[PDB]
Symmetry: D3
Subunit: 61 residues, 6 copies
């Protein structure tokens, strides 16, 4: 199983390590997937490259 | 945050429900994001559309 | 440029035609790119493959 | 609806803000999607990471 | 490495097998990666879900 | 056809140029796709953003 996590910049390296740990476990136990088969990708977004309702987060409070 | 889980066809509806649930909690507790801001996409693959070492799974003997 | 639009199943063929058209003009007029260089991909999701706050849409009551 | 716009580096911050505005509107009116439900991601490509017909744009005039 | 090939529906099963094989060798010999570390995903599009210059292929005359 | 190659940072600019050449050829001959229709994207991953079996490569030997 391939898991891609897309989130905004601003997380600690530790939060990222925990994210991978937790997410991998969540997948292992709910899908019966073998652990060495679970891959995780982290993709960080820039507030000026992410919008909702027509407004980029870089243009918001 | 946005989580996309890509895995082979086959999981039961229940397994998928648990995946979404578990994966969402794993994100929530590990990044600080709030539930209504956590989105999960499920993408299923066919054994004949997924290959490793030049061999599609469907062609593995 | 490449534009991928991911949305739930349900739109009519007409709606999709308008999406491609409108979205392409929006790109053309806003980035300077030329029409034959603008590509649009449409990706449809199932309510049981899309979740928010740990709940797939198909499971929302 | 989730819209990903993949384009080359070289656009102004204003062009990007307009892109998000225009594209969000194009989607709102052609798909009947609620505005606060329309998300836009901008992904910039490097000429040395984008090829056509076997030649990277970084290796062209 | 992970290679995703996105193309229109239509290729034969044989063509797909050759794609995976050829593409994998091309990666192996050009990046140094080892075969069991090279993954290929095949994604097929519908002519009515792919557009160029504001015109879906299915609508081209 | 659109080919995305996702691999770790650490490859020479030459290896990347060869990758695009080889991969484009592999696709041209196995799918009957016209050369000017074959597009290649290179996406580099950071070891601290790529995990396998719950452990990020940045946390491994």
């Amino acid at each position: 199983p391939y898991v891609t996590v897309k989130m905004l910049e601003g997380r600690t390296d530790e939060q990222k390590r925990n994210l991978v740990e937790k997410v991998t476990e969540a997948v292992k136990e709910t899908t019966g997937a073998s652990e060495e088969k679970i891959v995780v990708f982290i993709e960080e977004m820039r507030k000026d490259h992410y919008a909702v309702a027509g407004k980029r987060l870089s243009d918001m409070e």
